[PDB]
Amino acid sequence: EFMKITISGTGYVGLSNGVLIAQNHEVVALDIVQAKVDMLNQKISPIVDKEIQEYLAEKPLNFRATTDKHDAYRNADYVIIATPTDYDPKTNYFNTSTVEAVIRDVTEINPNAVMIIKSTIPVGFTRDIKERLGIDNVIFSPEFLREGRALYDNLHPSRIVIGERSARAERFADLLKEGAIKQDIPTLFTDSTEAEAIKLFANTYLALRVAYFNELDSYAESQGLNSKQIIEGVCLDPRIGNHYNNPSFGYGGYCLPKDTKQLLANYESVPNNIIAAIVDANRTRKDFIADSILARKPKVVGVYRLSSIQGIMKRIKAKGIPVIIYEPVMQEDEFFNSRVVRDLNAFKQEADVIISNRMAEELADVADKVYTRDLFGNDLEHHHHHH
Amino acid sequence: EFMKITISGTGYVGLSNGVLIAQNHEVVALDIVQAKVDMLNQKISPIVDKEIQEYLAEKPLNFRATTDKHDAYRNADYVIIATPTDYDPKTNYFNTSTVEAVIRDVTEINPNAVMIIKSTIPVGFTRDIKERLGIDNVIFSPEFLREGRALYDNLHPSRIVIGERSARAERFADLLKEGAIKQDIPTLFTDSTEAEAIKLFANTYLALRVAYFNELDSYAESQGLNSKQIIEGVCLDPRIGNHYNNPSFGYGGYCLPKDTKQLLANYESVPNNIIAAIVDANRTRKDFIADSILARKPKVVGVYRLSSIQGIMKRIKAKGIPVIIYEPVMQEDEFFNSRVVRDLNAFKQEADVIISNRMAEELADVADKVYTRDLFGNDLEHHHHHH
């Protein structure tokens, strides 16, 4: 078999899946920005990903890009939809417009193509859109990729999940296995809405674990105990494990805070205590961390390197104590009404307490006034949440 | 080295540690019941444990039992305290009298013996008793043993944790490693109160995991989704894993319900949401399960085999619906005011809904009226909570 697979959306999810599949099939990437299409056809990646750049430049891929929808979709066996979406927790609004625009375009241009949605979508989306438009050729498949390592994660995936139980779903999973380096990849075929719920439940469990080890750490600090001794002893249970057990100022990033809230909204009519507590626990942890810093009565608090630490900053400022930020990557002189300080020595001298997500050799000099609850941030082989 | 180790308490924890150590050192088990001492000296185990029975009867162990405290404790290098204790959640009372009696006896008879407490004790116990009595020769070491497999778990331990950082603590850990079959066992030395907190935090995390997958299952039932599809996809994340993810009527047993409450009481002055929610979540799950069964409007509910299922029974009875129990191991005709039915066919015929923790071939006959949320109870290699 030698199929045609079109990628609609050339961000890391679409491009890593396109490059993976272009090792063995015909892949056409659709993007309206001519400069990106030209880059791609010149074998230059528009995104930062070492392996995508290497594969595009060095391997014989049957890959091309076009700005033309008809050229892209015609005769495609599968179309991977990987366009941008966004969930807003304040309004419980999930913007799926880009995905719905591609479903409209593919249905019009090639109604026989099978669409595989890799974009993040709300639970129930695919069953509902199929019913709404009266079409059957849409399947959801979650992506488990890290930005920056997206082709690597497709070459060595944790698992492949396709949200339809059928031969055409299995042939798509086979495309993903054929291109991968990892062998015997766990493969699961589910119904649609169940597949759409997997990442919310997996990401909410990871947030739960960060929140739980952070409550263990709140207790250890309150009781004058050594958090690392307790966490190491707990995590030596093989059913618990030495991963995602690094105390912090709270879970953060662009995923866990939103997914935990999205899942909680989906529980509006389902009795629960854990789902709601995962969200509340992060606010409580940030309050506990800010209260600890404020108890030291600092006149100025310094933040060494720059999302949960921003929540701590908000609480310190709410008490009228100024915050200064050391962050070389930042060019502006102010961030959220707080001064950004360029000279490290000046920053260390002015800050009465320096808060950070990781101890750094640069702060050894002033360790006595450094407050961090991090335990594993300098162990490069340790697996935990980072944002 | 050839030491003398005395075991004070001959239940599964003390006897499995004594038999393990008697392969290479001199072990003396103290028990006031002459019949048990005689059994032990006749190489007969007073408890049910296949490996303890086999080792006592077939291996050349330097092991003996005595009812005499002086004979037992004199010249001991270490005394392992493994006497019964109990925590009552309603009153937040931890009865440690048996341990304190042994500490009194050893201090009087052999003040140079180093006591290793394996009995379960409250967080802070050892630091406080050492200060109270003005003694230094007491160290806590958690036990991670399953009743019935206790010698096996000492021969293949998850880890060894000793709550003192010292050479005499390390020599005791070496005794445990020398007797084990498993090699390179993870070994951790901590301070005292930290060691005492490990099992509460480990067991509360396992309860948290049962509670979380049970809330996922409440959602799947409410939404008409397939719980197994979602759980399998979630647990294929290697940071989550396919263990302790079996939906149930609630976590139970003699450990998780009490430890979660004991830990929550220890958080009286520590801000938290997750610790309190683990306890509340179990009540909410039992309410959800009972409500589901009551929605089917049964006139009689049957319980197939006989702690969380007891909570479901309480809720069904509170609504005035009778419950009948099928449990061959039970000889009485009534349990908590509910009839126990001896004939399976009669039980199946009378029960309008049959609830159980596991589907059984015996119920295939009446699967349409069987309600169970179990997914992995018949997979003998699957690791999850069971009570």
φ/ψ of residue A250, rounded to 5 = 140, 155
Per the CB < 8 Å rule, is A215 touching B288?
Answer: no
H-state helical runs in chain B: 12-22, 34-41, 50-58, 69-73, 97-109, 125-133, 150-155, 167-179, 192-222, 227-235, 256-266, 274-295, 308-318, 344-350
Secondary structure letter of residue A46 according to DSSP: S
Neighbours of B318 (CB within 10 A): 10
**Among A202, A272, A284, beta carbon nearest to B237:** A202
Q: Residues B118, B143: contact at Cβ < 8 Å?
A: yes
Is beta strand B93-95 parallel, antiparallel or unpaired with respect to A86-88?
A: unpaired
**Among A195, A229, A274, beta carbon nearest to B215:** A274
User: Which position has the token pair 């007969």?
Assistant: B44
Per the CB < 8 Å rule, is A271 touching B284?
Answer: yes
Q: Which of A103, A139, A137, A136 shows the shortest CA–CA distance to A8?
A: A103
User: Which position has the token pair 């996922």?
Assistant: B216
- CA A177 and chain centroid, separation: 23
Buried b / exposed e over A103-141, threshold 16 CB at 10 Å, is bebbbebbeebbbbbbbbbbbebbbebbeeeeeebbbbb
Sign of the Cα torsion A74, A79, A84, A90 reads: positive
Q: Which of A180, A255, A300, A366 is catalytic?
A: A255
Chain B residues near residue A225 by CB distance under 8 angstroms: 191, 193-194, 197
Q: Which of B33, B98, B291 shows the shortest CA–CA distance to A271?
A: B291
Chain A residues near residue B161 by CB distance under 8 angstroms: 233, 236
Spell out the residues 6+ positions from residue B54 whose beta carbon is closer than 8 angstroms to its own: none
Buried b / exposed e over A249-285, threshold 16 CB at 10 Å, is bbbbeebbbbbbbbbbebbeebbbbbbbbbbbbbebb
Q: Residues A250, A215: contact at Cβ < 8 Å?
A: no
Query: Which of A210, A229, A284, A386 would best serve as a mutation to test chain B binding (most B beta carbons within 10 A)?
Result: A229
- Chains A, B: CB contacts within 8 A come to 184
3-state secondary structure A267-334: CCCCCCCHHHHHHHHHHHHHHHHHHHHHHCCCCCEEEECCCHHHHHHHHHHHCCCCEEEECCCCCCCE
Find, in chain A, the residue whose alpha carbon is nearest to that of B235.
A202
Per the CB < 8 Å rule, is A272 touching B215?
Answer: yes
User: Where is chain B broken, named by the residue before each break, C–N > 2.5 Å?
Assistant: 306
Method: X-ray
Say whether A166 sits in a helix, a strand or coil: coil
Find, in chain A, the residue whose alpha carbon is nearest to that of B232.
A188
Q: Report how far apart the first and last C-alpha atoms of chain A are (Å, whole number).
A: 41
Cα within 13 Å of Cα(B90), Cβ side: 0
Chain A residues near residue B262 by CB distance under 8 angstroms: none
Map out the domains of chain B with their CATH numbers.
Answer: 1-199 (3.40.50.720), 200-289 (1.10.1040.10), 290-387 (3.40.50.720)
Find, in chain B, the residue whose alpha carbon is nearest to that of A385.
B239
Query: Which of A176, A201, A243, A263 would best serve as a mutation to test chain B binding (most B beta carbons within 10 A)?
Result: A201
Neighbours of B337 (CB within 10 A): 9
Task: Quote the minimal CA–CA distance from A348 to chain B in Å.
Answer: 31
CA distance A195 to A198: 5
Say whether B22 sits in a helix, a strand or coil: helix
Is beta strand A114-117 parallel, antiparallel or unpaired with respect to A78-81?
A: parallel
Burial class (CB in 10 A: 0-12, 13-18, 19+), B60: exposed
Task: Quote the minimal CA–CA distance from B374 to chain A in Å.
Answer: 18
Secondary structure letter of residue B37 according to DSSP: H
Resolution in angstroms, to 1 decimal, for this deposition? 1.4
User: Which position has the token pair 């341990």?
Assistant: B99
Helix axes A192-222, A227-235, angle to 10 degrees: 140
Spell out the residues 6+ positions from residue A214 whose beta carbon is closer than 8 angstroms to its own: A247, A248, A250, A251, A281, A285, A373
CA distance B202 to B167: 27
- CA A292 and chain centroid, separation: 30
Buried b / exposed e over B223-251, threshold 16 CB at 10 Å, is bebebebbbbbbbbbeebbbbbbbbbbbb
Burial class (CB in 10 A: 0-12, 13-18, 19+), B287: middle
User: Which position has the token pair 């599968």?
Assistant: A78
Find, in chain B, the residue whose alpha carbon is nearest to that of A384.
B239
- Write the CA distances from B119 to A168, A179, B122, B127, integer angstroms: 58, 55, 10, 15
Q: Which of B234, B255, B279, B360 is catalytic?
A: B255
- Write the CA distances from B177 to B62, B161, B173, integer angstroms: 17, 11, 6
3-state secondary structure A199-238: HHHHHHHHHHHHHHHHHHHHHHHHCCCCHHHHHHHHHCCC
CA distance B146 to B140: 19
Q: Residues A41, A64: contact at Cβ < 8 Å?
A: yes
CA distance A41 to A29: 10
Dihedral angle, C-alpha B147, B148, B152, B153, nearest 10 °: -20
Query: How many residues does the structure list for chain A?
Result: 387
**Among A194, A208, A212, beta carbon nearest to B226:** A194
CA distance B187 to B184: 9
Q: Is A235 considered catalytic here? A: no
Q: Residues B375, B227: contact at Cβ < 8 Å?
A: yes
